[PDB]
Every structure is written in structure tokens, then in C-alpha cells.
Amino acid sequence: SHMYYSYGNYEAFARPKKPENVENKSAYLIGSGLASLAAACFLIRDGQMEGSKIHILEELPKAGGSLDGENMPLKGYVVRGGREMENHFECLWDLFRSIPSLEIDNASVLDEFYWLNKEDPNYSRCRVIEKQGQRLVTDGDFTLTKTAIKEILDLCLTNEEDLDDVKITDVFSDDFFNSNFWIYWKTMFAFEPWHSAMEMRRYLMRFVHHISGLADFSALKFTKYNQYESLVLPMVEYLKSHGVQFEYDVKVEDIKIDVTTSQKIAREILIDRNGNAESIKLTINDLVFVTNGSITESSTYGDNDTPAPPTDELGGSWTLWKNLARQSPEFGNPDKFCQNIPKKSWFVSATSTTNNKEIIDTIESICKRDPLAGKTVTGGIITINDSAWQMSFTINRQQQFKDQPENEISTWIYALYSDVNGDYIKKPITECSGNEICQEWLYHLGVSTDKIEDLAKHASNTIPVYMPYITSYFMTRAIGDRPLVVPHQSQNLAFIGNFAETERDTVFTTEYSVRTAMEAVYQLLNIDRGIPEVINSPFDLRVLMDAIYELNDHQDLREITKDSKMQKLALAGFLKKIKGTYIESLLKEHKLL
Amino acid sequence: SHMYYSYGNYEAFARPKKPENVENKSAYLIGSGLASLAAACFLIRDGQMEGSKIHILEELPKAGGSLDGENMPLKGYVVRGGREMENHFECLWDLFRSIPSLEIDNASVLDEFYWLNKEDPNYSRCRVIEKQGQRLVTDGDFTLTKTAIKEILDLCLTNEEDLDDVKITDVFSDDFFNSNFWIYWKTMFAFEPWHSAMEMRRYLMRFVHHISGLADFSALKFTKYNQYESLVLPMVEYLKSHGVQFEYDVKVEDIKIDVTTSQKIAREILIDRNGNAESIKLTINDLVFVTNGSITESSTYGDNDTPAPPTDELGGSWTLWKNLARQSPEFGNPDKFCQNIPKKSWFVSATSTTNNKEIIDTIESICKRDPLAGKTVTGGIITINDSAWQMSFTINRQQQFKDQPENEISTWIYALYSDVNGDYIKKPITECSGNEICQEWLYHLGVSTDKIEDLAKHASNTIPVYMPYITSYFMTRAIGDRPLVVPHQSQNLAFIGNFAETERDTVFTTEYSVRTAMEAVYQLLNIDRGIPEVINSPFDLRVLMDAIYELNDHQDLREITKDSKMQKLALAGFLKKIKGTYIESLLKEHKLL
Ligand SMILES: Cc1cc2nc3c(=O)[nH]c(=O)nc-3n(C[C@H](O)[C@H](O)[C@H](O)COP(=O)(O)OP(=O)(O)OC[C@H]3O[C@@H](n4cnc5c(N)ncnc54)[C@H](O)[C@@H]3O)c2cc1C
Ligand SMILES: Cc1cc2nc3c(=O)[nH]c(=O)nc-3n(C[C@H](O)[C@H](O)[C@H](O)COP(=O)(O)OP(=O)(O)OC[C@H]3O[C@@H](n4cnc5c(N)ncnc54)[C@H](O)[C@@H]3O)c2cc1C
């Protein structure tokens, strides 16, 4: 193609030559989420494109998209969701080592993040609770049977090309869905049983190097504040310092694209700049980066006394992608992702803010840390295993908002099941006000029922959010439902974000938006530098040995095959062949012998 | 330990916090070769130690050590040797992305190197010649038998701990030593048959990712000029710009070190600053970095009419290490490396400089490129397979010296066998003047015998070098013959360079001197940043598949087991199990099916 994949320090530390003819080129980016902001950064840093020639078109009043986090007027503090990150976000760390921190002088976002997560390393002291505040007895074990582990491996051993439209329930049976592994997995990643087995396979291979840090979240890393303040604003400042044009309340309705037998060229961007319909006409030297689709599109907000009103509106993002899909099948199949979403699916998240000491003290007694100490609190989500909603909640380092009073915590809450009565509040989450969500949560923390209503109604402000498309990334798909980052024969059109198509990597991650942004800029501008591949961990023998050990809850190879002689016989035969060799040493080194 | 290994961009791009109490610390570095210069750079950049507190002590009049390259007065142009490098010199590229280029403004040594090797990618058009100038018929094939390949794998499958004092001839039989593979291997890496099987195993695993670029040198990368001008001088300028003290003609005779039951502390450096004997007394906050041993120590130089005089002098480097070994067995076993070196071993290298058109035209006719064009010429060494000396020669990009006339080439020549009469000059190389080495070389290029003596004597200036210890890295060794980079309980003493002990990596490489330098600085100062591991290629399934394909001269798995039914039966059984799975896809992707 117009790019190549690499790994290692040589390509990481190298600077690309200024790409050819970039002086006569411009860039239009549809949306101002993380993908578009990352594409613009690469355009500045590695494309050496003029800032004033880069135009970011956003339909909302501000930037960031799904990376939001704000004190919403007449409502309260809101996080549409948190962001778990990890060391092997290979592209995203390439980007943010070049973004100046807004807190620490002469340091980058990576530096401040790197130091913070060493000062205050993330881990969970309590991962799963049940029976109104009691820690799950087996918390920390995966409780996978040998049958469940085999299905996990059969899935990874399945070609991606054979998982078209296959569901997670099509490839796993009873034992797996009964495991603690599935509890940790489905909740930390927001998988539903009807979601894409293809994506879940991508996930099993993508984070295999962190399976030992799965139950305790010790592989997770977190920014200092919410992702708007810690990621979006550093990017915007950097971009603004280079003269990049930001255009808000501009809704891209369509892009007219010539798809001939030899070329795809974007010709005109049909926009609605606040009520009025206008156009931007393009040449071949005007590059268009489309964030196609969005999980946060058409979001509604409730308040402490009002449910967030459910909706099925196709907003601008999904109507744009549909209008583009009308012009070539190579531009993807939006309806696979925005249509026929089950009403059981996750729709609602809520931010519960309180300074009340009974609430805060109850959270301390479950998570074993002071929620107001300024460090890790829950270390990630706590899952209420036996909750009807399949609800989970987390308290990040407090306060997640620079402007927030230092005696308040904000708790983020979400529910995997949206069409089921709660256990204390006898309604589905979609039917619930802020305070009713809070009440159902407080009940599962063991708060005395005598106090739940008053603590929720009067000692807390809880803002709910209804997101019709929050599960849209994971909908069952076929190869081809997502456009290439640079479709075949495209001259000036790229698709970026978590609905574009690239190899191996996992969607529902910020890394995917930076990778697609990076690959699009590199291909359209023919930048002469490698793109870091998705980390090679599933091909690494040492990581595969570790995974066998971890998946079998820390049993060596003799314990594993202990009670099946057909496999035990082969082990003895295997050990005869490898005794006194380097394979026996590696296996011992990774606790398999 | 006081360090950890990592890989990936997160650790690569991160900056370490200023280490604790570094303000009250100093550094003494014994030698000014690449290791010491690299240790000082890391001390400046990542240790944030004051430059004026860093003291580099060198016995020679200038810096660089084995990285030399100069117009030696009354002699001629000399390169003690070239430097093949590769992309996965993980530590060295970490270092040199921080070293400013002396040619390109606002660019680093890595940048200029990275760009140059893309502008002018290295490859050989002619790797092995014989019969006075004819290309080897099988050049490009490895001509390994299945028996030779099995021995290669049995070696890698042997624990390092079981190769103590084992020779290369102890683990390989006839077929291997008859292969083209061994021709390429022994000459590009300067292995002798009596050298350490342990190191050769380390080499097989270390560069397994480049086995496809072995015969044509397409994996090699080269600096613009000789390594003194392109590597040493950029470092010195950087170091000097930070106030580092350089001390020349200072010979370190001994370091007094307290080795107690609980600590090793260096107390005093006994020096000879030009004739006079002096001392430097140390506290625990004075760090000492010892480059122990040297392959270039005690080098003698001839000229066009005089042999370089053979020697067996222990110079300052080997006497220093012996004096240190007298103080603890934990400081290594110098005699394994500087004593009992076979007289057949490589001792002599020579730089032949000429502007003569018959010589230059003859080289063009073998290497197929214009030697004076300013780009790649031989792409690496050309090996004269049927030469009694087992001689090889290379012409790098010309001119290798910024000051050299643009109508001259310099050819670097070396011989693996030092005690055998040449085929045209009937003497061992050690007995030969500059011009006699040149004459023997010219004969193997097909130069008409009528012209050889005059072209060598009068149309060329050839400077020979006698290096008693040039093969010293590869001498058979046991675990323990080399000190840890930071010996157990050392407080202020580290050993650096290619005679120190670290995991997996290969000596006779510049990467090893930067890695040992990096690890020593990081351990003694407790720098809070990862050290990049030796590249994980021998654990990568995809690289192991490629190696099977390449080692079997590009045969798939059916061709390989074609004529052994005991293995063919197992293949059929293997293929039954994996058909329609992702393993079958990977194998096809890597040409094994
Ligand atoms: C609740 C939640 C939790 C998450 N947790 C994690 C996590 O733990 N770890 C992780 O790695 N990732 C997480 N993510 C994912 C990450 O936040 C998203 O993947 C990422 O922000 C996607 O960014 P994007 O730029 O690709 O698109 P989006 O974030 O969806 O942004 C699209 C933007 O474009 C604008 N736009 C859309 N259509 C149009 C149009 N037609 N015209 C003009 N403008 C338009 C929108 O206004 C929006 O600003 C989470 C996301 C959510 C919602
Ligand atoms: C001919 C040749 C070809 C090579 N080719 C390659 C190649 O292709 N690729 C590759 O990666 N590497 C190659 N190398 C290796 C690389 O050049 C060396 O590994 C590297 O330079 C070692 O540096 P060092 O600092 O570890 O020690 P040295 O280079 O040996 O330097 C030691 C220095 O310390 C000084 N010193 C020694 N003892 C004392 C003392 N007692 N007191 C004071 N000062 C002292 C010496 O004067 C010298 O300057 C080659 C080396 C040679 C000789």
C-alpha cells in the first residue's frame, strides 16, 4: 500500500521526511472527536501541513466527542464514560509524547501520564460484589473449566474470515458464561452475548499480554482528570498553537464522491452551518477525513428527577455515513451498526456526585481506600454480579474535574441490561431518573433501605445519559461492513475512528481512533515512516505460555492434564522429547513446568 | 534488580524522572570507546548528572576506541574495520535519536542515518567470488542440508548454560561447514571454527529476523562516513556541549575495590597521566564505569612497504582487567579472552586506497556499481571463497573520509586465516607489507598477473594493522567469565562493553556497548524507565516460520519432508488437525503451505 507496519525503536524514534507536495494540500476532518484531532496532529507533526489549511468541522458546540466530561448547566457533573488505557496503545503513545502537558512545564501528555501511573499505580482491591455489598468469594479466580478454555482457543484458532455475523453465543457454551472470566470480560469491555464473536476474538488476541492483570485491573492506566481535560484540551491547545481552524455547529450532511472505474475523489462537502445550507468544493489536493458513525451520537440527558429520554434518532453522524454508503458499497454498511440494536442493550450511564459521608464511607468499606484521598479509589469498575441490571460502577481519582469541590466524589455507573426491572427500583434503567439509578446502586452497596431514598434524592445529584448507539461498535459484522481507512483507489478520502477497517486491532478503544487517524494521514500523504503494528503479543511464545498458565488459574502442565490420560500420555511423551532442552527451561520459566 | 526490561512505544517515548540524589554524584569512565561515550550520554540525558562531574579517562590521544577512522600521518587512510548495523539495535537507536547530527541542522544522528539508508538502501550484487574474479555459482542459496539445519536448531534448542567452553566445531558436522550459509555467516560476523558455540547460538537467535537478508546484505545499514566521523564525533560534540571532561593519555592501571561480605565499593583509581603516577580517590557517590578488555588493544600499524609488526603485548586494557580480576572472581576471567589465542586467528586488516582506474574498473566489473558514484559499492564484504587466507573485502560509500579526494576509493580487507601462505603471495598475511596484501587481493579480483605488482606498489597505498585481540570477543567462554554489568552488591562499580555480561544480546556489536552502557547507568542511578529488551524475534512465531522457509531455501512444508516418510506421515496428520484453522492461514501466509 501507501504505508508499511514496523515495530521497535528505529522506526519509533525516526522522523519522516516532509512528504511530497504537501505545501499544496489542505485537510478537512469531519467531527472533532479523538480520531479527527489525532489525524490533525499527525498532519501538523509528520505531514508538516500548514495549520491554517486544516479545517475541523464539528456539529456540537465543543470538541472531543465521546471523550467528554463537563459540569453540564442546570444538571451536574457528567462523564459519558471513563477511559481504561494500557501501555501497548502503540499509536496513541506515539501521538501524545508530542502533545505538551497543560500542567507540567516542559513535559508531554505521555510524560505526565507515565509518571502519574507510576506514582499511583492502578489496581482493584475489590472487583465483584453481590448480596448487597459482599465481595464475591472467588474474586480473582477465572473459574473457567477446561471446556470453556478450549472454546476460548477454538475461537482464536478460527479465521477472522469465518466469523462473519457470528455472535458470541454462537461459539461459547454454558461453562464459559458461568465463569468469573466472563464477568470480568463482559463488564470491563461492555460485551453483550449477542455481540460480534469476531471482535471478541480480536480482543482475546489483542490483550493476551494482560490476562494476569484482568481480575485486579493492574494492567490498566488512567489519566489525571476526565479525558476531556487530560486528552482533548492538550490536543486542542497544540492544534490551536499551530493555526488549525475549528468550526463548530457545522453539520456535514453529505460528501459528493466520484467513484469511477479508476478513482474515488471527494468533490464537495455539503454542510449546514447553523441552519443555513452551504458547500465546500474540493480538489484532489483537499483531503477529507470522515469519522463515520458514532457511539455517542443522539445522546440525551436526564437529571436527578428526570430520566434521560430514550431516542432512536439518526443524528448527523449516522445520516452522513448512510449518505456516503449510498455512493459505494466500499464505504461500509452503517445499518449493521445503527439498526436493530436490541432493547436489552446498554443504553444508560450515570454520574452520581455526592459529598455525603455515609455514601463515601460505604464506598470506602467496599473498595478499602479513601475516595477523597486524591488517588486510586476503585481501581476500575466494581461489578454487582447479582444485579438485575448487570450494573457496574467506578470511582476514578478524585476529583475528576479540576473545578470540582475537594469534598465531593463523582461515581460513574452503567448497566448492561436496559429492559429489566431493578432489584430495589422495580423498573428498567431507561425508565429511571438520576435519583432512582442512584437508589438502585445504593441498595447494592448495602446501604440501609431506611436511608436509600433520602441519600439519593437529597444527598446526591445523579445525571443519567441515554446513548442509543453506545453498543454500536460490537454489533455482529461481516468483513466489508466497515470501510478501509483508505478505500481502494481513493485519492483524497479516508475513513477514521472505530467504524473504519484495519487489521487485528480492537474497537471501543482510543488506540483505534489514533491508529486509524495515523494510517489515513500516512497513506494519503505517503509519509515515509513506519506505522507501529498492533503489539505482537499473540505471536509471542512467552506471552502464549503465560496465558496458558493464567487461564488455567495458575496450574502447571501436569496439573492441567491431571485427569485426562489421553492428554497425560502425550505430555509424558512431550516431556521425554524436551527434557534438558531450552524448551523445558522456557516452560519452567513461565511456570508451566 | 535496579532495572527492568520493556518494549513498545510507551517506554520508548517516556522520559525518566530525575533520579534520586544524582546532584551529589560524579562519574568516571575508563576508556573513551563507544561504551563509555554512550554511558556518559545516558548520564547527561537520563541521569541529568552535571557534565563537569563526568570524567572520561582515555589512554590514547583521541576518543572512539574501536570506532576509529583517520588519515594516519606518514601512512595513509586507515579503517581498523567497518560497522554493519541493523534496525533492531534497540538501545543504540534510543541513544542516537538524542545526538545532534553534525551535517543536517535540526536533525539527529538517527534521522540522518535513517534517511540515508532509505535514499541509498544497502544490498550486495555479488557476495562470494572464486577462481580469480568469478561469482560463486550458488551465490544466494544457503546450500544447507537437512542435517545441517537440524544441527542449527539443536544448538538453539541447547540451554546457554550447557555450552560452557563448547566450540563451534563441537556442535556442527561436515554438511554445515560445507554450506554457503557458513560462508556468509563466518565472514560477515568473523566467526572462527574454534570460537564459542554459545555466542554463535546467541547470534542465530539474535538476528533470526534477518535470515532472508543474509546472503545479499539487504538487512544491513551503514553510516555516511567512517564510524569515527559519523558516530564518535557527534557524541563528543554533544558531550562537550554539556561540559563533560575528557582526559587523554591517561592510563588506568588499577582500581582499588573493597569486596566485603555485604558490599563492593570502588575506592581509588590508580592512573598514569603521561609518565607520572597519580590517584583519584572515590566516595560511594563517585561512579566508576570500566570498559573491561578490548579487541583493538595493542594494535600495530605497517605501511605500503612494511608489515604491521605482530605483537602479544598486554596493553593497559587487558592489564587493567587482570588487576581487577585479582580482586574478585565476580569481576571476570580476562585470560579466557586474551590468552591462548590461536595463531591461525584473524589478526590483520588493511585499508587499500587507490585512484587508479584499472583497479577501480575491475571492482566495478565484480560489484556492478561505480565505486566513485558516492553510493553503495559492494553493499558489504565480498568473500573470496577459495582464497587461502579466507580473505574478504568491502568498499563502503565513497569517500568514507570527508577530507578524501573525490577520485579515490579506500578498500577495507581482512583475512580469517593468519598462518597460511597466500595463493599469489606465498606468505601468511602477518608476514606481508601493505602492498603484498594488496597484491594478493588484486590477484583474486582477476587482475592480470603482469600488472599486479605495479598496481599494488605504485598505484595504491595499503596500510595494514595487526590486532592481537580482534577475535577476543568470540573465544570459548563459560558463564561467569564475564562480569555482570553491575556485579552483585556493587554500589558504584559497573562494567560496560562487549566483555560484560548481559542476557541474550550478541557481542562484536556496537549495540552491545550501548546496551551495557545503558544498563549500567540505569542500575547505578536507579533510573525509573524501562530498558528495551533484545528484540523479541526468536520468540515470535511469525519470524520462526519465516526462518524455516528461508533456511530450507524457500521450500514449503511438503517439499521439506518430501523424502522422509516418518516425517511426511506426521505432516499429513498435522495438516488434518489444522485445515480450515488460523494456523493453516498463518502457515500459508509465511509460505510454509
Ligand atoms: C462511555 C464510554 C466509555 C469508553 N471507555 C473507553 C475506555 O475505557 N477505553 C478506551 O480505550 N476507549 C473508551 N471509549 C472509546 C473512546 O472514547 C472512543 O472510541 C473515541 O472517543 C472515539 O472517537 P472518534 O473520534 O473515533 O469518534 P467519536 O468520539 O464518536 O466522535 C465523533 C465526533 O464527531 C462529531 N460528528 C459526528 N457526526 C458528525 C457530522 N455528520 N458532522 C459533524 N460532526 C459530526 C460528533 O459531534 C463527535 O464530536 C469509551 C467511549 C464511551 C462512550
Ligand atoms: C575491525 C572491527 C570491525 C567491527 N565491525 C563491527 C560491525 O560491523 N558491527 C558492529 O556492530 N560492531 C562492529 N565492531 C565492534 C565495535 O566497533 C566495538 O564493539 C565497539 O567499538 C566497542 O567499544 P567499547 O567502547 O566497548 O570498547 P573499545 O572500542 O574496545 O574501546 C576501548 C577504549 O578504551 C580505551 N582503554 C582501554 N583500556 C584502557 C585503560 N586501561 N585505561 C585507559 N583507557 C583505556 C582504549 O584506548 C579504547 O579507546 C567492529 C570492531 C572492529 C575492531
Contact B239, B44 (CB under 8 A): yes
A91 with A233, same domain? yes
Nearest residue to B226 via CA among B45, B438, B402: B402
Regarding beta strands B128-130 and B382-384, do their DSSP bridges make them parallel or antiparallel, or are they unpaired? Answer: parallel
For B46-77, the DSSP string reads TT---GGGEEEE-SSSSSBTTS--EEETTTEE
Q: Which candidate, A421, A351, A430, places its Cα nearest to that of A388?
A: A421
- CATH number where A275 lies: 3.50.50.60
Q: Is A83 annotated as a binding residue?
A: yes
Domain co-membership, B352 together with B441: yes
Mutate to test the pocket of ligand 1, among A66, A84, A288 (most ligand atoms within 8 A of CB): A66
- Pair A364, A390 in one domain: yes
- Residue B474's nearest CA partner among B439, B520, B507 is B507
Strand ranges inside A105-249, DSSP E: 128-130, 134-135, 245-247
Give the residue ranges of DSSP H helices in A211-309.
227, 233-240
Read off the amino acid at residue A533: E
**SS3 for B414?**
strand
Whether B436 and B520 map to the same domain: the answer is no
| Atom number of ligand 1 nearest to Cα A496 | 26
In a domain, A198, yes or no: no
Does the annotation place B529 within a ligand binding site?
no
Do A388 and A449 have their domain in common? yes
Residue A382 is part of a domain; what is its CATH number?
3.30.9.80
Same domain, B78 and B47: yes
Taking the CA atoms of residue A184, residue A190, residue A193 and residue A198 in that order, the dihedral angle to the nearest 10 degrees is -100
Q: Which of A446, A466, A486 is the last residue of a domain?
A: A466
User: Is A513 marked as binding a ligand?
Assistant: yes
H-helix or E-strand containing B434?
helix B434-444
Q: Is A126 near chain B, with CB under 8 Å?
A: no
Same domain, A486 and A515: yes
Burial (CB count within 10 angstroms: exposed 0-12, middle 13-18, buried 19+), residue B105: exposed
Cα A146 from chain centre:
30
**Phi, psi (degrees; rounded to nearest 5) at B83:** -140, 100
In a domain, residue A1? The reply is: no
Cβ–Cβ under 8 Å, residues A499 and A317: no
**Distance between alpha carbon B481 and the CA centroid of its chain, in Å?**
20
In a domain, B579, yes or no: yes
The grid coordinates listed for B585 are: 492461514
Classify residue A354: in a domain, yes or no.
yes
Residues 6+ apart with CB under 8 A from B465: B78, B80, B299, B300, B301, B302, B308, B348, B349, B350
Instruction: Find, among A67, A14, A76, A81, the residue nearest to A37 by Cα.
Output: A67
C-to-N gaps above 2.5 Å in chain B, after residues = none
Q: Which of A239, A15, A209, A230 is nearest to A111 (CA)?
A: A230
Q: Both A64 and A44 in a single domain?
A: yes
Q: For residue A544, give its domain range.
A: 537-589
Handedness of CA A476, A479, A484, A490 (dihedral sign): negative
- Residue B76 CA to ligand 2 center (angstroms) comes to 21
Domain limit, last residue, from A417, A447, A466: A466
Looking at the domain assignment, is residue A174 inside a domain? no
Residue from A29, A291, A338, A513 to probe ligand 1 pocket by mutation (most atoms less than 8 Å from CB): A291
Residues A516 and A492 in one domain: yes
Mark whether B236 and B330 lie in a shared domain: yes
The SS3 call for residue B170 is helix
Q: For residue A163, what are the contacts with CB-CB under 8 A and spacing of at least 6?
A: A196, A197, A198, A201
Do the beta carbons of residue A524 and residue A494 sit within 8 Å? Answer: yes
Backbone φ, ψ for residue B141 (5° rounding): -90, 155
Domain boundary pick from B428, B451, B466? B466
Kind of pairing, strands B264-273 and B250-259?
antiparallel
Q: How far is the CA of B60 from the centre of ligand 2 (A)?
A: 13
CA of A277 to the centre of ligand 1 (A): 25
Residue A299 contacts by C-beta under 8 Å, 6 or more apart in sequence?
A80, A465, A466, A467, A468
CA–CA distance, A383 with A417 (Å, rounded to integer)? 13
The Cα-based distances of A426 to A132, A387, A388, A423 in angstroms read 16, 12, 10, 6
Domain count, chain B: 3
Query: Which ligand lies nearest the alpha carbon of A318?
Result: 1
Of A28, A77, A203, A417, which one is the catalytic site residue?
A203
Instruction: Characterize B544-568 residue by residue with b for buried, 16 or more Cβ atoms within 10 angstroms of its Cβ, and e for exposed.
Output: bbbbbbbbbbebbbeebbeeeeeee
Inside any domain, residue A189 = no
Burial of B146 (C-beta count, 10 Å sphere; 0-12/13-18/19+):
middle
Residues B245 and B309 in one domain: yes
Q: How many CB atoms lie within 10 A of CB A4?
A: 12
In Å, what is the CA distance from B450 to each residue of A181, B380, B446?
Answer: 82, 29, 11
Among candidate residues B314, B333, B164, the one with its CA nearest the CA of residue B251: B314
Q: Which residues of A touch B574 (CB under 8 A)?
A: none
Q: Count CB atoms within 10 A of the CB of residue A433.
A: 22
Nearest-ligand number for the alpha carbon of A496? 1
Any domain includes B442: yes
Give the burial class of B175: count Cβ atoms within 10 A of its Cβ; 0-12 exposed, 13-18 middle, 19 or more buried: middle
Our CA angle for B497, B499, B500, nearest 5°, is 75
Distance CA A391, CA A444 (A): 9
Same domain? For A445 and A585 the reply is: no
Within-domain flag for A273: yes
- For residue B490, give the DSSP letter: B
Distance CA B343, CA A188 (A): 66
